[PDB]
């Protein structure tokens, strides 16, 4: 069960990382949006 | 002990992720600060 517990923790951690990765893609679009507006 | 070693590693990894997550919150404030200044 201790092995299963670690596996469930690491699954959860990977989901957290994926949420940060998607936040990063939104921040690239935000910086792109600022750069677009000052170059309009 | 190998199970305990993995657990300590994953604890450490989670702390690293939390540092990146907080860096992300500071980058949102930075992009907000740029957007605020060009809209002043």
């Amino acid at each position: 069960q201790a092995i299963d517990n670690l596996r469930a923790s690491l699954e959860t951690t990977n989901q957290a990382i994926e949420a940060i990765r998607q936040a990063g893609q939104e921040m690239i679009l935000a910086v792109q949006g600022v750069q677009d507006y000052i170059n309009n | 002990q190998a199970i305990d070693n993995l657990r300590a590693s994953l604890e450490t990894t989670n702390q690293a992720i939390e540092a990146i997550r907080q860096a992300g919150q500071e980058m949102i404030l930075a992009v907000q600060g740029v957007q605020d200044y060009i809209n002043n």
Binding site: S9, A16 | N14, R21
Partner: peptide
């Protein structure tokens, strides 16, 4: 730009929730 930063903030909050869940599983 504000919509993109809102969506980013939402995803960072979901990441925090998931990290606390990971930590709680490890405690067990």
């Amino acid at each position: 730009v504000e919509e993109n930063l809102k969506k980013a903030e939402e995803k960072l909050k979901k990441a925090e929730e998931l990290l606390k869940k990971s930590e709680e599983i490890l405690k067990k």
